[PDB]
Amino acid sequence: DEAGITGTWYNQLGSTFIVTAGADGALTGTYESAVGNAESRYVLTGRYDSAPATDGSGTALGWTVAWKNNYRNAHSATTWSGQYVGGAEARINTQWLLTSGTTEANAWASTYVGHDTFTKVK
Amino acid sequence: DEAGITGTWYNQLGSTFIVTAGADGALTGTYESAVGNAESRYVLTGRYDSAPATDGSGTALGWTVAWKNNYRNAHSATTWSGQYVGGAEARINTQWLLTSGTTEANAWASTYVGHDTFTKVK
Amino acid sequence: DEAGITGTWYNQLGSTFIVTAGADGALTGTYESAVGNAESRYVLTGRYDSAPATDGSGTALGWTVAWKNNYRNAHSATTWSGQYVGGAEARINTQWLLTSGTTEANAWASTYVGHDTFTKVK
Amino acid sequence: DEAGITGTWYNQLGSTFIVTAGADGALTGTYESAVGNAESRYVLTGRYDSAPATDGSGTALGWTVAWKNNYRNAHSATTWSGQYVGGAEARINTQWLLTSGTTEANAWASTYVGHDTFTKVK
Numbered sequence: 001d002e003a004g005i006t007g008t009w010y011n012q013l014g015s016t017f018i019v020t021a022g023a024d025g026a027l028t029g030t031y032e033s034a035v036g037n038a039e040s041r042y043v044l045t046g047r048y049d050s051a052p053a054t055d056g057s058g059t060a061l062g063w064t065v066a067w068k069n070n071y072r073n074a075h076s077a078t079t080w081s082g083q084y085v086g087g088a089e090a091r092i093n094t095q096w097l098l099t100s101g102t103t104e105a106n107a108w109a110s111t112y113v114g115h116d117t118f119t120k121v122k
Numbered sequence: 123d124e125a126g127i128t129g130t131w132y133n134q135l136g137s138t139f140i141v142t143a144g145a146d147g148a149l150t151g152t153y154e155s156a157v158g159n160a161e162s163r164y165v166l167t168g169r170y171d172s173a174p175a176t177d178g179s180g181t182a183l184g185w186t187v188a189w190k191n192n193y194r195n196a197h198s199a200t201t202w203s204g205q206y207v208g209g210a211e212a213r214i215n216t217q218w219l220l221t222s223g224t225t226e227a228n229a230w231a232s233t234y235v236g237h238d239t240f241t242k243v244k
Numbered sequence: 245d246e247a248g249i250t251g252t253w254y255n256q257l258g259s260t261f262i263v264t265a266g267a268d269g270a271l272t273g274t275y276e277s278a279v280g281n282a283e284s285r286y287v288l289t290g291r292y293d294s295a296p297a298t299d300g301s302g303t304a305l306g307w308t309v310a311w312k313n314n315y316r317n318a319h320s321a322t323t324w325s326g327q328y329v330g331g332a333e334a335r336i337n338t339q340w341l342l343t344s345g346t347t348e349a350n351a352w353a354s355t356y357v358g359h360d361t362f363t364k365v366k
Numbered sequence: 367d368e369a370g371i372t373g374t375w376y377n378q379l380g381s382t383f384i385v386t387a388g389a390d391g392a393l394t395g396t397y398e399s400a401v402g403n404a405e406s407r408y409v410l411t412g413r414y415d416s417a418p419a420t421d422g423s424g425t426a427l428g429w430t431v432a433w434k435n436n437y438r439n440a441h442s443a444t445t446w447s448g449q450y451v452g453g454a455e456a457r458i459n460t461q462w463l464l465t466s467g468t469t470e471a472n473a474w475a476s477t478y479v480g481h482d483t484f485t486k487v488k
Contacts, residue, residue, distance in 0.1 A: 013474060025165065025188050035474055043147065045167040046201075047188035049223060053197050057223040058232075062201035064184035066147050066169035075175050079168075079184040079201030081219035083232060095219050095233050095357060097203035097479070101171060101179035108379060108401055110180075110205060111217050113235075113339060113463065113479035115359045135352060157352055217479060219357065230257060230279055235341065235357040235461060237481045269409065269432050287391065289411040290445075291432035293467060297441050301467035302476075306445040308428035310391050310413035319419050323412075323428040323445030325463035327476060339477050341447030341461050345415060345423040354424075354449060355461050357479075 001059045004086050005048060009118035017044070017092075017118055019063070025050040031065045037074035038067060048084070058083030061092070075101040080116065092118040123181045126208045127170060131240035139166075139214075139240055141185070147172040153187045159196035160189060170206070180205030183214070197223040202238065214240035245303045248330045249292060253362035261288075261336075261362055263307070269294040275309045281318035282311055292328070302327030305336070319345040324360065336362040367425045370452050371414060375484035383410075383458075383484055385429070391416040397431045403440035404433055414450070424449030427458070441467040446482065458484040 005021040018041075019029035027046035032038075046063025062081040067074035082094030098112040127143040136156035140163075141149050149168030154160075168185025184203040189196035204216030220234040249265035258278035262285075263271050271290035276282075290307025306325040311318035326338030342356040371387040384407075385395035393412035398404075412429025428447045433440035448460030464478040 025190060026167065027186075035471075043169060045148065045169060045186075047165065047167060047186045047199055049188050049190050049195065049197055049199065051190060051195055052223050056225055057197060058229075060188060060197055060199040060221050060223045062186035062188070062199040062219070062221065064149075064167075064169045064186060064201065064203075066171050066182060066184070068147060068171050068173060073171065073173055075171055075179065075182055077169055077171065077182040077184040077203060079186065079203040079219065081186075081199060081201040081221040081233060083221055083223050083229075085226070093229065093232075095221070095359070097184070097201065097217050097219060098475075099182050099184065099203040099205055099217070101174050101182045101205050103177070103179055104207070105401075107180070107205070107215065108480055109464075109478055110215075111203065111479050112475055113357070113477050114474055115339070157349075217481070220353075227279075230358055231342075231356055233357050234353055235355050235479070236352055237461070269434060270411065271430075287413065289392065289413060290430045291409060291411060291443055293432050293434050293439065293441055293443065295434060295439055296467055300469055301441060302469075302473070304432065304441055304443040304465050304467045306430040306432075306443040306463070306465065308393075308412045308430060308445065308447075310415050310426060310428070312391060312415055312417060317415065317417055319415055319423060319426055321413060321415065321426040321428040321447060323430065323447040323463065325430075325443060325445040325465040325477065327465055327467050327473075329470070337473065337476075339463050339465070341428070341445065341463060343426050343428065343447040343449055343461070345418050345426045345449050347422050347424075348451070351424070351449070351459065354459075355447060 001052060001084060001086065004090060005084050007120065009092060009120065010122040011116040011118050021048060023050065027061065027063050037072060039071045040069060042067060042069050058085045090120055123174060123206055123208065126212060127206050129242065131214060131242060132244050133238040133240050143170060145172065149183065149185050159194060161193045162191060164189060164191050180207045212242055245296060245328055245330060246294065248334060249305065249328050251364065253336060253364060254366040255360040255362045265292055267294065271305065271307050281316060283315050284313060286311060286313050302329045334364055367418060367450055367452060368416070370456060371427070371450050373486065375458060375486065376488045377482040377484050387414055389416065393427065393429050403438060405437050406435060408433060408435050424451045456486050460484070
């Protein structure tokens with residue numbers, strides 16, 4: 001799956017996820033969001049299961065973006081948790097958590113939840 | 123918050139989170155879970171907002187563990203998304219998503235959600 | 245949207261959501277799941293915003309099923325939280341939480357998270 | 367657990383949850399939020415497992431509030447998904463999803479996720 005995961009992915013929002021999968025389970029790359037308080041590329045790092053099951057199961061993985069770069073700081077971080085599913089129409093199916101820095105009074109409303117589906121075309 | 127985040131953290135379950143914060147926004151270290159299909163330490167990587175707001179808000183961060191090491195492989199990955207809050211009773215307040223690799227028939231039940239509070243003592 | 249919400253809805257798994265929207269903001273009906281520890285219909289109840297914004301926003305709603313009926317008891321409950329979007333291809337876009345009754349030792353793993361999209365055809 | 371669940375509950379934010387558990391698995395009552403775009407009481411409805419496991423497990427339940435009443439309309443709905451744990455320090459441990467009505471361009475940011483713990487005192 002190192003080969004499978006490594007490359008350029010796109011989600012349903014038109015965001016771009018550029019990733020390299022290391023032999024050691026590492027994910028490194030950049031994320032470009034089409035929405036929200038974001039412009040240009042942000043560093044991402046993550047992990048994946050480098051010895052997945054042989055029973056037709058997907059490959060668990062996840063990664064993080066902190067929404068600071070040379071242009072903008074959105075004082076937030078998203079984590080994607082999902083699985084990679086190989087084959088002619090390869091997908092990464094994720095759910096995510098976006099947390100903002102907040103005061104203790106607003107901490108109840110700190111975290112958004114959603115879902116992103118990444119494909120190799122779009 | 124580089125100083126504040128770097129070190130050993132403990133959650134409500136007895137898990138141990140050993141992290142270094144980089145000047146560049148990186149998180150690197152190891153995670154040892156007190157529960158589930160886990161033994162010994164697992165690599166983690168993540169990101170944090172290295173220039174947080176000065177209005178008394180927390181510092182957004184996240185990280186990932188893939189549940190594979192030299193002892194076990196749980197074919198799963200957890201991402202934590204949260205904020206660091208400083209001061210004498212410093213805390214990392216997180217929500218997490220744990221995704222298993224599944225077949226497509228079982229993909230609806232792939233992902234658990236929970237919440238973990240990390241402190242510097244116990 | 246009382247008229248628009250009331251009726252039979254189908255999700256991407258083949259599940260059947262039969263609902264009546266009350267003028268008072270009540271949702272009542274039955275849920276038949278195509279997957280998991282379930283057979284036949286289960287009672288559902290919920291609420292919706294009966295005076296939504298007129299700026300082209302969706303209508304917020306949610307409901308609960310407890311997975312007990314005369315055939316089976318899965319010792320669990322799912323809540324759907326979402327919005328109704330009207331028009332030619334009407335949808336209810338939801339995220340859900342499924343909690344099982346658990347011992348205190350397994351309560352970290354009590355809750356699944358997912359997402360369901362309901363349409364009037366399928 | 368009909369008797370255990372029925373009554374007045376309070377969460378860590380100082381919100382008030384007034385519920386009646388029906389023999390039929392119904393939950394009905396009122397919710398008063400101490401935070402957000404809310405004042406006074408809101409209708410709630412939900413479900414619980416009225417025949418839980420006898421092995422020490424918690425009792426699965428969930429409920430919904432639509433944030434409209436005679437005073438305000440926040441064009442939103444929260445669903446709590448959780449379990450009732452009986453005894454001298456009785457608890458309802460929940461995770462919640464708050465969904466706002468949005469335009470389709472803001473729908474990625476429609477949903478908050480958090481966690482509330484309800485006790486009989488405070």
